[PDB]
Amino acid sequence: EERKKELAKEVIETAKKLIEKLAKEE
């Protein structure tokens, strides 16, 4: 995978982890 696309996908994966925590903790 092209690196800049990969970095954008890593942004999404990290924000998804944050969404998981927010839901766990609400």
Numbering used by the authors: 1 to 26
Task: Copy text from the publication.
Several natural systems exhibit ‘facilitated dissociation’, in which an effector (E) can bind to a target–host (TH) complex to form an excited ternary complex (THE)20–26 from which the target dissociates quickly. We set out to design protein systems that undergo facilitated dissociation. We use a switchable target binder (host) and a flexible effector that can rapidly bind to and switch the target–host complex to induce a large steric clash with the target, forming a strained excited ternary complex. We show here that by explicitly considering excited intermediate states when designing coupled protein systems, a broad range of facilitated dissociation systems can be designed.
Because state Y clashes with the target, this conformational change is slow when the target is bound, limiting the rate of effector association and the overall rate of facilitated dissociation. This slow step could be bypassed if the effector could instead first bind to state X and accelerate the transition to state Y. An induced-fit mechanism could provide the driving force: an intrinsically disordered effector could weakly engage with state X, and fold and make more extensive interactions in the strained ternary complex in state Y35, driving the transition in a power-stroke-like motion. The two effectors make nearly identical interactions with AS1, but when unbound, the peptide is disordered whereas the 3hb is structured. In contrast to this induced-fit mechanism of the flexible effector, we find that a rigid effector provides reduced rate acceleration even though it binds more tightly. In kinesin and other biological systems, it is difficult to directly assess the role of flexibility and folding upon binding in overall function; by contrast, our designed model systems allow the direct comparison of flexible and rigid effectors and show that the former yield faster conformational transitions against loads.
